[PDB]
Amino acid sequence: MSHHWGYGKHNGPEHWHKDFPIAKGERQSPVDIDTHTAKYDPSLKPLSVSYDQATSLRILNNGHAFNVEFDDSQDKAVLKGGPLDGTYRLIQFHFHWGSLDGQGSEHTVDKKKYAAELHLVHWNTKYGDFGKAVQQPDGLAVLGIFLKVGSAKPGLQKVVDVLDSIKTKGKSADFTNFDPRGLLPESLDYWTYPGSLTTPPLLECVTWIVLKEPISVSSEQVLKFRKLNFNGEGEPEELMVDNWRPAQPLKNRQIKASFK
Numbered sequence: 593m594s595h596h597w598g599y600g601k602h603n604g605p606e607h608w609h610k611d612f613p614i615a616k617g618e619r620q621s622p623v624d625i626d627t628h629t630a631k632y633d634p635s636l637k638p639l640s641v642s643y644d645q646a647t648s649l650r651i652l653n654n655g656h657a658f659n660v661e662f663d664d665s666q667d668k669a670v671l672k673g674g675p676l677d678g679t680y681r682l683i684q685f686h687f688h689w690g691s692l693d694g695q696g697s698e699h700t701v702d703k704k705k706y707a708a709e710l711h712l713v714h715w716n717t718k719y720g721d722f723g724k725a726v727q728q729p730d731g732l733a734v735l736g737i738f739l740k741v742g743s744a745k746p747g748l749q750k751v752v753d754v755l756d757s758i759k760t761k762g763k764s765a766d767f768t769n770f771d772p773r774g775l776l777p778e779s780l781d782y783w784t785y786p787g788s789l790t791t792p793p794l795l796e797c798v799t800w801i802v803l804k805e806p807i808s809v810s811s812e813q814v815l816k817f818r819k820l821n822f823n824g825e826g827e828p829e830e831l832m833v834d835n836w837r838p839a840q841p842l843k844n845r846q847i848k849a850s851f852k
């Protein structure tokens with residue numbers, strides 16, 4: 593049992609994978625999030641998030657997929673809470689689509705699947721930029737937002753009118769004075785699921801968070817995109833969906849979460 597000191601055969605060879613805890617901690621395993629098995633963990637530090645200045649300026653398309661831009665020139669919204677060593681700022685996000693006329697999201701929570709979901713990427717500003725954050729595992733994290741269908745337009749009539757302007761991909765339209773808070777609650781507690789990507793052991797500087805209060809969206813909002821092209825006009829009528837991800841459950845004993 594006693595480990596004789598003075599040697600170090602294992603302390604000799606050193607590689608890229610052997611350097612970072614990427615290979616030493618392989619958690620690459622896609623699985624559906626379960627709320628029933630989730631457990632409340634009040635270990636995190638309760639904090640208050642901001643989002644009063646949060647506002648958009650315009651929306652640019654990439655000829656297929658577009659993301660919403662925000663004015664980082666001010667203190668829009670910031671996230672904080674837990675053993676984190678720095679606050680997380682948000683810059684932009686996008687939404688995925690589905691192949692079915694009822695559902696088709698990336699991950700599935702509470703053994704349930706949604707039609708679409710928002711993808712808000714954030715980077716710890718404490719480390720300066722994502723470039724310095726990627727240098728460590730707990731550097732930069734990713735927030736995963738989900739969207740549920742309610743068929744009840746929360747007063748987005750105008751949002752549908754401006755949409756007729758971006759019928760084809762590759763164009764843009766200036767749109768400021770957005771109200772993303774009108775649908776986003778304070779959100780105190782929320783489940784979590786840290787780990788790495790579903791790709792070979794390379795990087796683990798990505799965390800997967802999930803809020804217990806997903807942003808609600810009407811089926812009428814996506815009913816307009818259904819008629820839109822998947823990449824500019826002139827192409828065969830096909831769905832713009834292209835964000836499918838597997839997650840077969842092996843067993844799932846207990847999942848970490850800040851909320852019960």
Ligand SMILES: CC(=O)Nc1nnc(S(N)(=O)=O)s1
Nearest residue numbers: 657686688698711834835836
């Ligand atoms: C390098 C990289 O970011 N790749 C992906 N981007 N996000 C993707 S998604 N949300 O469409 O799955 S492809």
Ligand SMILES: [Zn+2]
Nearest residue numbers: 686688711835
């Ligand atoms: Zn995405």
